[PDB]
Design an enzyme around this catalytic site. Structure first.
Site, mmCIF file in Angstrom:
data_model
loop_
_atom_site.group_PDB
_atom_site.id
_atom_site.type_symbol
_atom_site.label_atom_id
_atom_site.label_comp_id
_atom_site.label_asym_id
_atom_site.label_seq_id
_atom_site.Cartn_x
_atom_site.Cartn_y
_atom_site.Cartn_z
ATOM 1 N N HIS A 39 3.564 -1.204 -5.315
ATOM 2 C CA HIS A 39 2.727 -1.787 -4.283
ATOM 3 C C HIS A 39 2.177 -3.142 -4.707
ATOM 4 O O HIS A 39 1.980 -4.035 -3.875
ATOM 5 C CB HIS A 39 1.602 -0.805 -3.970
ATOM 6 C CG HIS A 39 0.502 -1.423 -3.190
ATOM 7 N ND1 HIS A 39 0.589 -1.617 -1.824
ATOM 8 C CD2 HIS A 39 -0.692 -1.921 -3.569
ATOM 9 C CE1 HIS A 39 -0.518 -2.184 -1.398
ATOM 10 N NE2 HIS A 39 -1.298 -2.403 -2.440
ATOM 11 N N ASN A 50 0.918 -1.927 3.345
ATOM 12 C CA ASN A 50 0.728 -3.361 3.212
ATOM 13 C C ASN A 50 1.515 -3.846 2.003
ATOM 14 O O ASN A 50 1.127 -3.584 0.857
ATOM 15 C CB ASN A 50 -0.747 -3.729 3.089
ATOM 16 C CG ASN A 50 -0.977 -5.198 3.314
ATOM 17 O OD1 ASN A 50 -0.103 -6.011 3.049
ATOM 18 N ND2 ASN A 50 -2.158 -5.547 3.791
ATOM 19 N N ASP A 69 -9.558 -2.833 -1.292
ATOM 20 C CA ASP A 69 -9.741 -1.383 -1.218
ATOM 21 C C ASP A 69 -9.903 -0.735 -2.595
ATOM 22 O O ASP A 69 -10.161 0.466 -2.659
ATOM 23 C CB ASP A 69 -8.635 -0.724 -0.375
ATOM 24 C CG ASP A 69 -7.221 -0.947 -0.918
ATOM 25 O OD1 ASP A 69 -6.897 -2.084 -1.299
ATOM 26 O OD2 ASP A 69 -6.381 -0.021 -0.828
ATOM 27 N N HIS A 83 -5.868 -1.527 -8.837
ATOM 28 C CA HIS A 83 -5.243 -2.839 -8.644
ATOM 29 C C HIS A 83 -6.266 -3.754 -8.007
ATOM 30 O O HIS A 83 -7.427 -3.382 -7.837
ATOM 31 C CB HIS A 83 -3.887 -2.771 -7.923
ATOM 32 C CG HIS A 83 -3.936 -2.425 -6.488
ATOM 33 N ND1 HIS A 83 -3.952 -1.117 -6.049
ATOM 34 C CD2 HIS A 83 -3.906 -3.203 -5.381
ATOM 35 C CE1 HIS A 83 -3.929 -1.106 -4.721
ATOM 36 N NE2 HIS A 83 -3.902 -2.360 -4.297
ATOM 37 N N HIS A 112 -6.667 -5.385 -5.049
ATOM 38 C CA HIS A 112 -7.013 -5.548 -3.644
ATOM 39 C C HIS A 112 -8.407 -5.018 -3.340
ATOM 40 O O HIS A 112 -8.992 -4.236 -4.086
ATOM 41 C CB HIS A 112 -5.961 -4.863 -2.767
ATOM 42 C CG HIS A 112 -4.659 -5.581 -2.742
ATOM 43 N ND1 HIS A 112 -3.478 -4.936 -2.464
ATOM 44 C CD2 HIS A 112 -4.323 -6.882 -2.908
ATOM 45 C CE1 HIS A 112 -2.475 -5.782 -2.498
ATOM 46 N NE2 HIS A 112 -2.965 -6.981 -2.740
HETATM 47 C C1 LIG Z 1 -6.905 -4.212 1.354
HETATM 48 C C2 LIG Z 1 -5.382 -3.984 1.423
HETATM 49 C C3 LIG Z 1 -5.021 -3.329 2.778
HETATM 50 C C4 LIG Z 1 -5.624 -3.676 4.005
HETATM 51 C C5 LIG Z 1 -5.244 -2.997 5.203
HETATM 52 C C6 LIG Z 1 -4.255 -1.985 5.192
HETATM 53 C C7 LIG Z 1 -3.678 -1.660 3.983
HETATM 54 C C8 LIG Z 1 -2.611 -0.745 3.478
HETATM 55 C C9 LIG Z 1 -1.900 0.246 4.401
HETATM 56 C C10 LIG Z 1 -1.416 -0.115 5.570
HETATM 57 C C11 LIG Z 1 -0.738 0.936 6.450
HETATM 58 C C12 LIG Z 1 -0.678 2.189 6.055
HETATM 59 C C13 LIG Z 1 0.009 3.260 6.929
HETATM 60 S S1 LIG Z 1 1.755 3.432 6.403
HETATM 61 C C14 LIG Z 1 1.820 3.729 4.608
HETATM 62 O O1 LIG Z 1 2.402 4.574 7.080
HETATM 63 O O2 LIG Z 1 2.459 2.189 6.764
HETATM 64 C C15 LIG Z 1 -1.265 2.585 4.710
HETATM 65 F F1 LIG Z 1 -1.190 3.874 4.273
HETATM 66 C C16 LIG Z 1 -1.847 1.694 3.947
HETATM 67 C C17 LIG Z 1 -2.491 -0.876 2.134
HETATM 68 C C18 LIG Z 1 -1.547 -0.215 1.195
HETATM 69 O O3 LIG Z 1 -0.426 0.089 1.688
HETATM 70 O O4 LIG Z 1 -1.925 -0.075 -0.016
HETATM 71 N N1 LIG Z 1 -3.342 -1.785 1.760
HETATM 72 C C19 LIG Z 1 -4.073 -2.354 2.762
HETATM 73 N N2 LIG Z 1 -4.586 -5.189 1.213
HETATM 74 C C20 LIG Z 1 -4.967 -6.439 1.643
HETATM 75 C C21 LIG Z 1 -3.934 -7.294 1.299
HETATM 76 C C22 LIG Z 1 -3.806 -8.824 1.497
HETATM 77 C C23 LIG Z 1 -3.215 -9.402 0.187
HETATM 78 C C24 LIG Z 1 -2.904 -10.930 0.250
HETATM 79 N N3 LIG Z 1 -2.137 -11.523 -0.845
HETATM 80 C C25 LIG Z 1 -4.000 -11.821 0.856
HETATM 81 C C26 LIG Z 1 -2.680 -11.600 1.614
HETATM 82 O O5 LIG Z 1 -2.847 -6.477 0.622
HETATM 83 C C27 LIG Z 1 -3.355 -5.147 0.642
HETATM 84 O O6 LIG Z 1 -2.764 -4.226 0.189
HETATM 85 ZN ZN LIG Z 2 -4.007 0.207 -0.741
HETATM 86 ZN ZN LIG Z 3 -3.259 -2.871 -2.328
#
Ligand SMILES: C[C@@H](c1cccc2c(-c3ccc(CS(C)(=O)=O)c(F)c3)c(C(=O)O)[nH]c12)n1cc(CCC2(N)CC2)oc1=O
Ligand SMILES: [Zn+2]
Ligand SMILES: [Zn+2]
Length: 232
Positions: A150, A181, A89, A85, A87
């Site tokens: 997601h 997120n 990461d 996707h 993002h």
């Molecule tokens: C890089 C990613 C990103 C940056 C930082 C963190 C994340 C997480 C994440 C967070 C907590 C947990 C622990 S948990 C499941 O127990 O909560 C996890 F496992 C994954 C995930 C995911 O969940 O994929 N992506 C992350 N990003 C960044 C955005 C901004 C989009 C926007 N329009 C501009 C506002 O949107 C994203 O996705």
């Molecule tokens: Zn992610």
């Molecule tokens: Zn993502």
């Protein structure tokens, strides 16, 4: 020393590989975002005497370190990469890959969203994945579009030789307490999309989330559970 590496075990800027099955590895890196540090996974699949990469290591420097770790531990060239996707990461590091001879791919939807968001953009479009339930072959893997979860563009990857399901960020680890997120998520559709994954890959033996520890098919049900509770 053998266990799956965790967020506090990897400094931001280093990459570790973990052998999942014959010819299948995950890659694990860490990155800072909004003042917190997170781990994230990708996949490496042997493709004869070449390698297919799934997802970057969340940034240019991490992705350079990923290529170095692959050369040290595997020693075969990465020739193609797919981002699951839009993002950072998943695509952050695509420019590094492109300068290291890697052909980079993503769905047209991912490419459009990455461009609109200011993220790095894979070069090549993957057709045949625009309707939920669509699947296409790509070297040694199958790519599957489960529907919005997601993100609206998220893809899943299956390695049929090893029954490895890489869920990407549509699938969470068992310890998760919320849906991660959710900035670009569809919490209402996500359980339906997970159900499509469950129905399409009932023989999966390893399930790898986009962030955190691999496990078995239970990760799919757990994901549905945490997403439903998040929405509520
Ligand atoms: C890089 C990613 C990103 C940056 C930082 C963190 C994340 C997480 C994440 C967070 C907590 C947990 C622990 S948990 C499941 O127990 O909560 C996890 F496992 C994954 C995930 C995911 O969940 O994929 N992506 C992350 N990003 C960044 C955005 C901004 C989009 C926007 N329009 C501009 C506002 O949107 C994203 O996705
Ligand atoms: Zn992610
Ligand atoms: Zn993502």
């Amino acid at each position: 020393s053998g266990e799956y590496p965790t967020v506090n075990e990897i400094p931001v800027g280093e990459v570790r590989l973990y052998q999942i099955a014959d010819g299948v590895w995950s890659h694990i890196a860490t990155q800072s975002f909004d003042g917190a540090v997170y781990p994230s996974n990708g996949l490496i699949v042997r493709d004869g005497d070449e390698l297919l990469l799934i997802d970057t290591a969340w940034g240019a420097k991490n992705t350079a370190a990923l290529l170095a770790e692959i050369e040290k531990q595997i020693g075969l060239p990465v020739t193609r990469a797919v981002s699951t996707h839009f993002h950072d990461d998943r695509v952050g590091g695509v420019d590094v890959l492109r300068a290291a001879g890697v052909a980079t791919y993503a769905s047209p939807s991912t490419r459009r969203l990455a461009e609109a968001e200011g993220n790095e953009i894979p070069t090549h479009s993957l057709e045949g994945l625009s309707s939920s339930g669509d699947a296409v072959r790509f070297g040694p893997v199958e790519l599957f579009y489960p529907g919005a979860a997601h993100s609206t563009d998220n893809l899943v990857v299956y390695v049929p030789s090893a029954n490895v399901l890489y869920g990407g960020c549509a699938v969470h680890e068992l310890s998760s307490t919320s849906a991660g997120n959710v900035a670009d998520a569809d919490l209402a559709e996500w359980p339906t999309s997970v159900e499509r994954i469950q129905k399409h890959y009932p023989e999966a033996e390893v399930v790898i989330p986009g962030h955190g520890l691999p496990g078995g098919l239970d990760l799919l049900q757990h994901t549905a559970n945490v997403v439903k509770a998040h929405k509520n």
